[PDB]
């Protein structure tokens, strides 16, 4: 059996009931490698770690991908200027090339 440090009742036979906190079980290193700290933020709590992990990975991925789309938006917007050049005339020394 297992329990929190909350103790728990028990008595088989004329044995009086006793109740003992369950602890001395950390089971995790707060800081190792990032993979180590990952196993930690997996184990430092059994489950609250896990729910935090799933929700956090979800939200960070969605934030990053939103940033990515906004990046692409801005990039094509930056593309839009040079459509002057379709005139096929003098160059204005930018990153893209037509020497």
């Amino acid at each position: 059996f297992t329990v929190t440090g909350e103790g728990l009742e028990y008595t088989w036979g004329n044995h009086p009931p006793k109740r003992v906190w369950a602890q001395e079980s950390g089971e995790g290193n707060p800081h190792g490698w990032p993979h180590e700290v990952v196993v930690y933020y997996y184990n430092r709590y059994p489950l609250t770690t896990i729910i935090g992990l799933c929700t956090c990975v979800a939200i960070i991925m969605v934030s990053c991908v939103t940033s990515v789309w906004l990046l692409c938006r801005t990039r094509n917007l930056c593309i839009t200027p040079y459509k002057l050049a379709p005139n096929a005339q003098v160059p204005i020394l930018l990153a893209l090339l037509c020497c």
Partner: protein, 433 residues
């Protein structure tokens, strides 16, 4: 002087707090619950226990019959019996012909364990709550004190005008209809008091032991005496409540959550430590002193030696300091994060010494007070390996505040540049004309 507070329900754990005043030297306390006593306004309703069944002398003649009456007993029966023809040893069969005379009059009554042992069937009403504490304040030692929950109770011990709560939480696991044998005790959904439950549980359907009102039915039915045998063959119900006394279950005390128990006579629930208590206590303002006469603080610094997050105050740290002059001065923990073993220490000249404390933290960065001078000792990283901790979120570590700001700043900055881009382009397009 009176100071009040709201203390959380801490049945076992103590509670110190330094109390100060401008121009006055401070003083600590130490409150510690001793009992919690939850007394409903209950009562018993009726009792039940094993029955008994006796038989008077069944009538007999040579011929003819006597008559069966309403011999007043619970479930009592009687019936004539004709042509009985029963013999007696070395007799003459008690007749010369058809006897016809046998009433088999019956009787039901109560057992004798009833005296020693019977049901205890109760209606349990609102009632009260109270509790015992121990105060070891200031200069005061163990002063264990008991009082009722009500937020009114004016109680003075020494100089402590106690006013208690009442408790935030407002419930104990009880029930109006709860019964009990022996030490055990059971919520009987309802003891069917007036209603004879076929004797299935209301085997003794009576208000009291001495209340000889048996509104119960053993369903006593007689059978015909026969075979020349003088007897009263019959049937009735087995002691049903006893039949359950085979099917007894888990007493509520054994099921009571919050690892707490019950008292027999008042149904005093015993120390289910839940809630907070707005207490109010007067203190001796004479027990105060001045503030200027005191050996003064100076040269503040504390060394965070080490703590490992464990139950016991498993962390030691020291101070390095120089005093105005030697003496003593309290060290209160306004932030009880690292739950200090200490609450008041002597302050010798250059009081540069240590203390002990537990926090659940992997590491804090916090501080607390000493000698009316709050000093900062952040709290180093803590190893892992009954009682509380700090435990809320103070277990913060380096990588946490590192990566959180990492990701937040990265996302913010990139999206900011992204939004900038648009108007950055548009401005010169406007400039075109």
């Amino acid at each position: 002087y009176e100071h009040t507070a709201v203390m959380p329900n801490k049945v076992g754990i103590p509670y110190k707090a330094l109390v100060e005043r401008p121009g006055y030297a401070p003083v600590h306390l130490q409150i510690q619950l001793v009992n919690t006593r939850i007394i409903p306004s209950t009562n018993l309703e009726y009792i039940t226990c094993k029955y008994k069944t006796k038989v008077p002398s069944p009538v007999v003649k040579c011929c003819g019959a006597t008559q069966c009456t309403s011999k007043p007993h619970p479930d009592y029966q009687c019936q004539v019996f004709s042509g009985v023809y029963p013999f007696m040893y070395g007799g003459a069969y008690c007749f010369c012909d058809t006897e016809n005379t046998q009433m088999s009059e019956a009787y039901v009554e109560r057992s004798e364990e009833c005296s020693i042992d019977h049901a205890k069937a109760y209606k349990v009403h609102t009632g009260t709550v109270q509790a015992m504490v121990n105060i070891t304040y200031g200069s005061v030692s163990w002063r264990s004190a008991d009082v009722y929950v009500n937020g009114e109770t004016p109680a003075k011990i020494g100089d402590a005008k106690l006013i208690i709560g009442p408790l935030s939480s407002a419930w104990s696991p009880f029930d109006n209809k709860v019964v009990v044998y022996g030490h055990e005790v059971y919520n009987y959904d309802f003891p069917e008091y007036g209603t004879g439950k076929a004797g299935s549980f209301g085997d003794l359907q009576s208000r009291t032991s001495t209340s000889n009102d048996l509104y119960a039915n053993t369903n006593l039915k007689l059978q015909r005496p026969q075979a020349g045998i003088v007897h009263t063959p019959f049937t009735q119900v087995p002691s049903g409540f006893e039949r359950w006394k085979k099917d007894k279950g888990a007493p509520l005390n054994d099921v009571a959550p919050f690892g707490c128990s019950i008292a027999l006579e008042p149904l005093r629930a015993e120390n289910c430590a839940v809630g907070s208590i707005p207490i109010s206590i007067d203190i001796p303002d004479a027990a105060f002193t001045r503030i200027s006469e005191t050996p003064t603080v100076s040269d503040l610094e504390c060394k965070i030696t080490e703590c490992t997050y464990a139950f016991d105050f498993g962390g030691i740290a020291t101070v390095a300091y120089k005093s105005s002059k030697a003496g003593n001065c309290p060290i209160h923990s306004p932030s009880g994060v690292a739950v200090i073993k200490e609450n008041d220490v002597t302050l010798a000249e250059s009081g540069s010494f240590t203390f002990h404390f537990s926090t659940a933290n992997i590491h804090p960065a916090f501080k607390l007070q000493v000698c009316t001078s709050a000093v900062t000792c952040k709290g180093d990283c803590k190893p892992p390996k009954q009682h509380t901790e700090s435990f809320t979120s103070a277990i913060s570590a380096t990588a946490w505040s590192w990566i959180k700001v990492l990701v937040g700043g990265t996302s913010a900055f990139i999206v900011l540049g992204l939004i900038a881009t648009a108007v950055v382009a548009l401005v010169l397009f406007f400039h075109r004309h």
